[PDB]
C-alpha cells in the first residue's frame, strides 16, 4: 500500500480552543449560592476605578485573555478625561476590535443590577454589539 495512508484510529487534538469553538467543552455548571455564575468559557470583566476603566476577557481558569484599559498609553494619548462614559465607549470599541483580532466572538457579561441601569455600561454593551462581539454565549451541545 501507500506509505502515507497510515493513520491512527484515534486522533489526538492538543488544541485547547477546539472544544470551546465546537461548543462541546465542559462548562463549570453549579454554584448558584455565590455570584457571578461560573458557567462560561469567556467572561467580560469591567472594573471601573475612580481614575481608569479596565475591561478584561477572562477564562474559567482565571487567566486573562485580552484586556483593554485606559492605563495604556496607546489609548491614553487618544482620549480625554479618563473616567467618562466616552472613555467606556473607547474601552468597549477597542476591546471589541481586539476580540475580533483574537478570534473570540462570544462571551458572558454578568452586570450588577445597578450597573445595568448605568449610562456607561449600557452604551459600552452597545459598542460591543456594534463592534461585532455577541454577548450571552451559546448553549452547550449535550450539556
Amino acid at each position: 500500500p501507500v506509505e502515507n495512508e497510515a493513520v491512527a484510529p484515534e486522533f489526538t487534538n492538543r488544541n485547547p480552543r477546539n472544544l470551546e469553538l465546537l461548543a462541546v467543552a465542559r462548562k463549570e455548571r453549579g454554584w448558584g449560592t455565590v455570584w457571578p455564575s461560573r458557567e462560561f468559557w469567556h467572561r467580560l470583566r469591567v472594573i471601573r476605578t475612580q481614575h481608569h476603566i479596565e475591561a478584561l476577557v477572562e477564562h474559567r481558569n482565571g487567566q486573562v485573555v485580552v484586556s483593554a484599559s485606559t492605563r495604556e498609553w496607546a489609548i491614553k494619548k487618544h482620549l480625554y478625561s479618563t473616567r467618562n462614559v466616552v472613555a467606556c465607549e473607547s474601552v468597549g470599541r477597542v476591546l471589541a476590535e481586539r476580540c475580533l483580532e483574537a478570534g473570540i466572538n462570544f462571551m458572558v457579561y454578568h452586570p450588577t443590577p445597578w450597573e445595568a441601569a448605568s449610562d456607561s455600561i449600557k452604551r459600552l454593551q452597545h459598542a460591543m454589539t456594534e463592534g461585532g462581539v455577541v454577548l450571552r454565549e451559546p448553549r452547550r451541545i449535550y450539556e
Binding site: 493513520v7 491512527a8 484510529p9 484515534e10 486522533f11 489526538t12 487534538n13 472544544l19 462541546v24 467543552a25 465542559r26 463549570e28 455548571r29 453549579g30 454554584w31 448558584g32 449560592t33 455565590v34 455570584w35 461560573r38 450588577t112 443590577p113
Partner: protein, 110 residues
C-alpha cells in the same frame, strides 16, 4: 401530659460522599437542612438544598470566599455590615472531572 408531639424520626440529613469517592452524574453528594455545605464546581442544587454531582469524577471539599447574589437582600446587608478587613469564608463541594468530554475516531476513509 403537657408536652405533646415530641416524637419524630430523623430525616437522615448529612454527608453522603467524602473526598476521594468516585461518583457519577446525578449522585447526591450531600443533603442538608440549612446551608451547611455550599455547591461548587460541577455540583447541582435541588430545591430541598441537596447537593448532587453534575459530572462523573472525584469529590473534593474546599474552603473559599462567599460572594453572595446581589438580589439577596439579607446577604448583601450582611456584606454591607462587615468591617473592611473581613471577608466571608464558606465551604464548598466540587467534582473534578475524570473522563474527557469525548474522543475523535476515524469512521470512514473516502
Amino acid at each position: 401530659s403537657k408536652n405533646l408531639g415530641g416524637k419524630s424520626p430523623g430525616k437522615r440529613f448529612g454527608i453522603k460522599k467524602m473526598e476521594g469517592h468516585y461518583v457519577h452524574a446525578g449522585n447526591i453528594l450531600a443533603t442538608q437542612r440549612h446551608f451547611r455545605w455550599h455547591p461548587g464546581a460541577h455540583v447541582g442544587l435541588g430545591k430541598n438544598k441537596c447537593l448532587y454531582a453534575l459530572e462523573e469524577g472525584v469529590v473534593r471539599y474546599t474552603k473559599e470566599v462567599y460572594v453572595p447574589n446581589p438580589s439577596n437582600s439579607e446577604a448583601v446587608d450582611l456584606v454591607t455590615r462587615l468591617p473592611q478587613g473581613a471577608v466571608l469564608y464558606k465551604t464548598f463541594v466540587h467534582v473534578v472531572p475524570a473522563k474527557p468530554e469525548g474522543t475523535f475516531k476515524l469512521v470512514a476513509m473516502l
